[PDB]
Design a protein around this ligand. Sequence first.
Ligand code: HEM
Ligand SMILES: [F-]
Length: 153
Amino acid sequence: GALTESQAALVKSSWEEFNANIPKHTHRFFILVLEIAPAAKDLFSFLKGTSEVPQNNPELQAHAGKVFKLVYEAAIQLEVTGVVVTDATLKNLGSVHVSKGVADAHFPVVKEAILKTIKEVVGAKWSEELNSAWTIAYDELAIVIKKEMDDAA
Ligand code: HEM
Ligand SMILES: [F-]
């Protein structure tokens, strides 16, 4: 699809709609994770020892917001520039995933949980042209993190 001026306009618009409700969209995002894969729960310090996903845990919210911001920035950078740029942050990201016991096969888990989360966030505006656009941007960003984990291990 590329990333036409018209596709980019569509991701920006849909991310703005996401940030508009962090405690919701972030606790949703963790449940769609634990639905696609239950075991994933022992990984998270703030989920260990718990039974249910905490709803007002700042550690949890801060964590999940950073996740989506990073996917959106990726999409604009693709329409302007044509690419996703790897910086210090993405590199330290890769380290911390490895410490915590995260692998590649975990990533379609978190993608589906993010497409499903954005299809839920935009509702009737949803178009092929938009699904195509977030898919392009996540795939493009995951390519870059997975790269950095492999490197931290
Ligand atoms: C493009 C996709 C992804 C992005 C942008 C991303 C981003 C991040 C960030 C920014 C942090 C640190 C947050 C903090 O310091 O507060 C983090 C931590 C973590 N991530 Fe990810 N992530 C991605 C995919 C995944 C996947 C597939 C998994 C596996 C289930 C995962 C598991 C974790 C865990 C266990 C931690 C440590 C949390 C701790 O115990 O406190 N991430 N991730
Ligand atoms: F994460």
